[PDB]
Amino acid sequence: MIREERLLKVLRAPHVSEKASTAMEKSNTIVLKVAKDATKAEIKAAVQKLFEVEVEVVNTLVVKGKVKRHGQRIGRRSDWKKAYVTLKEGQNLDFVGGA
Amino acid sequence: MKAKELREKSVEELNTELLNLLREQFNLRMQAASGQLQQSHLLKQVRRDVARVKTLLNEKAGA
Amino acid sequence: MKRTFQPSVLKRNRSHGFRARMATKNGRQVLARRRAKGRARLTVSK
Amino acid sequence: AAKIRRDDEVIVLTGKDKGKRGKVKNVLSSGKVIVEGINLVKKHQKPVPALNQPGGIVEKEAAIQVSNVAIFNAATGKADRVGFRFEDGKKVRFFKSNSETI
Amino acid sequence: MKKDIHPKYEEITASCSCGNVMKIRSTVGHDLNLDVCSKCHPFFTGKQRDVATGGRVDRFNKRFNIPGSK
RNA sequence: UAAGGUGAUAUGAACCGUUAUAACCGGCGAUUUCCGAAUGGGGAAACCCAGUGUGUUUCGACACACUAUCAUUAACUGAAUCCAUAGGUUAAUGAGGCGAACCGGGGGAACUGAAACAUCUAAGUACCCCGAGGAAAAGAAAUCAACCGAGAUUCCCCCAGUAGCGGCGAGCGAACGGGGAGCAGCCCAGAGCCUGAAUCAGUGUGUGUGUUAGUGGAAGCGUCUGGAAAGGCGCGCGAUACAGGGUGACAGCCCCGUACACAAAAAUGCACAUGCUGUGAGCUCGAUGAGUAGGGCGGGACACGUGGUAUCCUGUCUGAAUAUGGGGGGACCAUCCUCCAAGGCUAAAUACUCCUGACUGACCGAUAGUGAACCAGUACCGUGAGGGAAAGGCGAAAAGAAC
RNA sequence: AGGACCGAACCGACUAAUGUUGAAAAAUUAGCGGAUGACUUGUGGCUGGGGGUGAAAGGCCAAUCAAACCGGGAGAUAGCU
RNA sequence: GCUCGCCGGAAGACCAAGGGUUCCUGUCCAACGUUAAUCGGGGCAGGGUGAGUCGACCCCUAAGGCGAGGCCGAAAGGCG
RNA sequence: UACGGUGCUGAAGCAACAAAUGCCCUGCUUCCAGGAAAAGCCUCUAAGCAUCAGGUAACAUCAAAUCGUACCCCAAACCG
């Protein structure tokens, strides 16, 4: 499957939050982050051919994250964008854990 | 190998090496999982080789 | 009476609009004297 | 770019440490050329709370720039500018104006 | 645009009825159409009648064609 | 070349690397997160969706390829109309996009020095609009004169502030005459003989030598005073190097400038020597595109602002003759002169210093100078259209509260 | 039925009263109507200079416009201490 | 705890003027609260607001933009 | 017990009475200033297919096309 596609710049690290605990019960609703070209189309095809595992449904999130670092009121905002995905029912973290 | 040491090669990394070379950024580069006394920030100090193909392929396809 | 200062986007098309500050020649000298020659920035494009 | 090749002995003479002698230095882009660290008594910093607060008071960065005595040998600190001839193919190492090269 | 065999004219100059007054004179505004032209159509052929005033040594080309051609 | 470096102004930390790609300079080339100037169509600047293809895939789809308005020539196509023409489907190619200002087109003011303001000056400047290149506008004589003559044009001192016009008002403001700068002639309307012979637009080559790396590049010690003696003396030496300012000061003496010897990949300056694609050369014989002008009345810029009237213009209209002359002789016409047939082409002199490069400063040394030292056209007012600041500057070593 | 008589915030504008040394170029407290329309009421594109809609006003129109918030004419005229 | 208040056409609700991410807490005093100052969106260390169906692409327009060819046009620009 | 909660488990479970700001009512009435167009809803053919193609149905699936969603209101980060 298609290897000339936007996946190569479009992921970031996983996002580690408490919902890897509280929300993951009889399936795995885990948190991710993704970069500036992430329309849902490019986040859909990525996980199965990059990380070796297979998801149902993806949700995608305009998080407009205000920052300051200059001492005098200002700085940057980034692309920031969070995602959610669905590591299915029972395969959880069974060889390695990306937290 | 700073790219320039492998130039003899019959094909370029878009043949599937492009992903074996880039998986680390999304699977290991998080808090301390790629290291804690030995590694830190990899992608320019050493691993800058991968970006260089993206001119070269345009370079070669025309030669 | 309803004085005065406020922000909005849709009201920029006859008065405050960057492509119209280049479309009109009257704006075009300002635009260069304000950034391209004026050593500066605007960036407020939103 | 300096053509004098970093293994070498120098002193301070363009300042009150007049006479203080040492070799190789520490050299980077825009370095103040600190001889061998010929400092006296000058504090270090205490930001950390834990067991290791830097007890130091000497050898931190103390300046006298470029070179005022063209590599010492016996006495005398000229000529600096003089650029010589072939020794390495791609570069040239230098000594001073009566002794050819190192 | 009306006389186009001799290209254009709207100048702005005046009628001096009491010293150099700015009562503008030169703005033409009168139009005519239609003549039996060099093939078959009694065609849209515009004038004032100027053009046709000027028509007394042409064979339907040597002046007429100036805007016809390019 | 010569060794260190990761453009930074928290440097914490990785990680290249002193063998000849670690960065970084430089010739040329290559790079697309979407807008895009942007262009299938849409526009509330950062687009949101049409069209049709392509290598190939875990056969989900994919990263990607290309289109428009014009000016101009091929091909196919095609009306109310035998025919004509118009209008589409392509094929090709370049410009439409962007400059402060010059320059060509014209516009373009109001009041205001005139002691009144409906002449003028104001003012061809505010701007706004349109062109197309670095130089232009020009320019090859219905030019100027007295019979002496001059030669595209006019420039430069003049003559002159002369002639010369006026609410007789304030402004505007020539030319000839002399000295000079200058100091040369063709081509069609076209056939022939001649025939890569003269030029240049291009596009590769060698030198003659540029552009910049690489190559370089000067003198001294002691002593009394001494945080730095780089002052003072001594002259122990110095000079086409004694800019200016840096190094903690005042340094011929260390400098960094000069003065001088050596030298590049690879496009490529310009001059030539050439080479490949394209041009026209030589010498006869032919050749002659009037709606052009005239007036009679308007609008006119002209040295002449209404007036008797002056062109070369311009607009409703009218309307000849080929140099066996008359268009005109800065009133009108003699005597008689000069341009010349109304198509196109010319070496020199003028301006724009974008910015960056060489040298002078009874010029700016932050009450300023290009809005400009900044990183200040940036923020303190703006329904805003944007007017733009109060503002020079610790100082061996951030040597920046050890203790 | 009637621009009814008498009804809520969606209306303006009578004199005061604590509005003038402002909460304020305008709004106020126990009060008080025009009661469904000669009503006012809101996103935005047509009125872009000597304006341009008229319950017809010299009031408007940025809040004090008989032409101002423009700075380019222009550091104008100047009988002006 | 103990006794009562203000908004009573509630500063109850979700979100449209884009100004935008400065809500919860973990912790804080200038760069501020004309009092204390523990609180004030002050302000800082974390992170964040999960939309195939919400509404706007769409097919769609009354008013109104632009618009082939054009009636015209000083250069501008006007109306369709 | 991390003093938020979550861990284990669990009653009862019927009818009357009275009014909407809302549901039915693009019903149905009453009065006239006279309440705007392409569509879904529902079907007629034109061509041209025409032993071909189309559409409607049981059930099997995949695509579900860049935002925004945070604080905030008959109204202190709008404006004043």
Curated annotation (Swiss-Prot), chain A:
It comes from the Bacteria. Keywords: Ribonucleoprotein, Ribosomal protein, RNA-binding, rRNA-binding. GO terms for biological process: cytoplasmic translation; ribosomal large subunit assembly. InterPro entries: Nucleotide-bd_a/b_plait_sf, Ribosomal_uL23-like, Ribosomal_uL23/eL15/eS24_sf, Ribosomal_uL23_CS. It holds the Pfam family Ribosomal_L23. GO terms for cellular component: cytoplasm; cytosolic large ribosomal subunit. Changing residue 52 to K: No effect on trigger factor binding. GO terms for molecular function: rRNA binding; structural constituent of ribosome. Belongs to the universal ribosomal protein uL23 family. PANTHER family: 60S RIBOSOMAL PROTEIN L23A (PTHR11620). One of the early assembly proteins, it binds 23S rRNA; is essential for growth. One of the proteins that surround the polypeptide exit tunnel on the outside of the subunit. Acts as the docking site for trigger factor for Ffh binding to the ribosome (SRP54) and to nascent polypeptide chains. Part of the 50S ribosomal subunit. Contacts protein L29 and trigger factor. Might also contact SecE and probably does contact SecG and SecY when the SecYEG translocation complex is docked with the ribosome. NCBIfam families: PRK05738.1-1 (NF004358), PRK05738.1-3 (NF004359), PRK05738.2-4 (NF004363). This is Large ribosomal subunit protein uL23. It comes from Escherichia coli (strain K12).
UniProtKB/Swiss-Prot annotation, chain C:
Keywords: Ribonucleoprotein, Ribosomal protein. The keyword Ribonucleoprotein applies. One of its GO terms (biological process) is cytoplasmic translation. Gene3D superfamilies: 1.10.287.3980. One of its GO terms (cellular component) is cytosolic large ribosomal subunit. PANTHER family: LARGE RIBOSOMAL SUBUNIT PROTEIN BL34M (PTHR14503:SF4), MITOCHONDRIAL RIBOSOMAL PROTEIN 34 FAMILY MEMBER (PTHR14503). Part of the 50S ribosomal subunit. This is Large ribosomal subunit protein bL34. It comes from Escherichia coli (strain K12).
From Swiss-Prot, chain D:
Gene3D superfamilies: 2.30.30.30. Pfam families: KOW (PF00467), ribosomal_L24 (PF17136). SMART domains: KOW. InterPro entries: KOW (IPR005824), Rib_uL2_dom2 (IPR014722), Ribosomal_uL24 (IPR003256), Ribosomal_uL24_CS (IPR005825), Ribosomal_uL24_KOW (IPR041988), Translation_prot_SH3-like_sf (IPR008991). One of its GO terms (cellular component) is cytosolic large ribosomal subunit. GO terms for biological process: cytoplasmic translation; ribosomal large subunit assembly; translation. It comes from the Bacteria. Keywords: Ribonucleoprotein, Ribosomal protein, RNA-binding, rRNA-binding. One of its GO terms (molecular function) is structural constituent of ribosome. Belongs to the universal ribosomal protein uL24 family. PANTHER family: MITOCHONDRIAL RIBOSOMAL PROTEIN L24. Part of the 50S ribosomal subunit. Might contact the SecYEG translocation complex when it is docked with the ribosome. One of two assembly initiator proteins, it binds directly to the 5'-end of the 23S rRNA, where it nucleates assembly of the 50S subunit. It is not thought to be involved in the functions of the mature 50S subunit in vitro. One of the proteins that surrounds the polypeptide exit tunnel on the outside of the subunit. This is Large ribosomal subunit protein uL24. It comes from Escherichia coli (strain K12).
From Swiss-Prot, chain E:
GO terms for biological process: cytoplasmic translation; negative regulation of cytoplasmic translational initiation; translation; translational initiation. It holds the Pfam family Ribosomal_L31. GO terms for cellular component: cytoplasm; cytosol; cytosolic large ribosomal subunit. The modification N6-acetyllysine is found at residue 8. Proteolytically cleaved by protease VII to yield a peptide lacking residues 63-70. It is not clear if this is due to protein degradation or is a bona fide processing event in the strain used in PubMed:339950 and PubMed:10556732. In strains B, D10, MRE-600 and Q13 the only protein seen in PubMed:10556732 was full-length; the last 7 amino acids were sequenced only for strain MRE-600. One of its GO terms (molecular function) is rRNA binding. InterPro entries: Ribosomal_bL28/bL31-like_sf, Ribosomal_bL31, Ribosomal_bL31_A, Ribosomal_bL31_sf. Zn(2+) binds at residue 16. Its cofactor is Zn(2+). It comes from the Bacteria. Keywords: Acetylation, Metal-binding, Ribonucleoprotein, Ribosomal protein, RNA-binding, rRNA-binding, Zinc. The keyword Glycoprotein does not apply. Binds the 23S rRNA. Belongs to the bacterial ribosomal protein bL31 family. Type A subfamily. Part of the 50S ribosomal subunit. NCBIfam families: L31 (TIGR00105), PRK00019.1 (NF000612), PRK00528.1 (NF001809). This is Large ribosomal subunit protein bL31. It comes from Escherichia coli (strain K12).
